[PDB]
């Protein structure tokens, strides 16, 4: 997957999102560094959270 800066994924209108980005899984397109900074847990740990909780965490962080 191509990576995009946190600020880009947070502050881009849906219609302006790069075509390769799944708007429901923006976190997958963060660099490993940015993912760690934002969520503070491993990708695997995050993916093991119930989907509703993943989404709720993402909402505040601007990544929903």
Task: Quote the CA–CA distance of 44 and 33 in Å, as a whole number.
Answer: 15
Nearest to 34 by CA among 23, 24, 26: 26
CATH class, range 1-64: mainly alpha
Sign of CA dihedral 8, 10, 13, 19: positive
> Determination technique for this PDB entry?
X-ray
Task: Quote the CA–CA distance of 13 and 46 in Å, as a whole number.
Answer: 25
Residue boundaries of the structural domains of the chain: 1-64
Q: What is the resolution of this structure in A?
A: 1.7
Nearest to 4 by CA among 41, 37, 39, 35: 35
């Amino acid at each position: 997957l191509e990576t995009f800066p946190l600020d880009v994924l947070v502050n881009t209108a849906a219609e302006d999102l790069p075509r390769g980005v799944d708007p429901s899984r923006k976190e997958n397109f963060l660099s490993d560094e940015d993912f760690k900074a934002v969520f503070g847990m491993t990708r695997s740990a995050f993916a093991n959270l119930p989907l509703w909780k993943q989404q709720n965490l993402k909402k505040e962080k601007g990544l929903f």
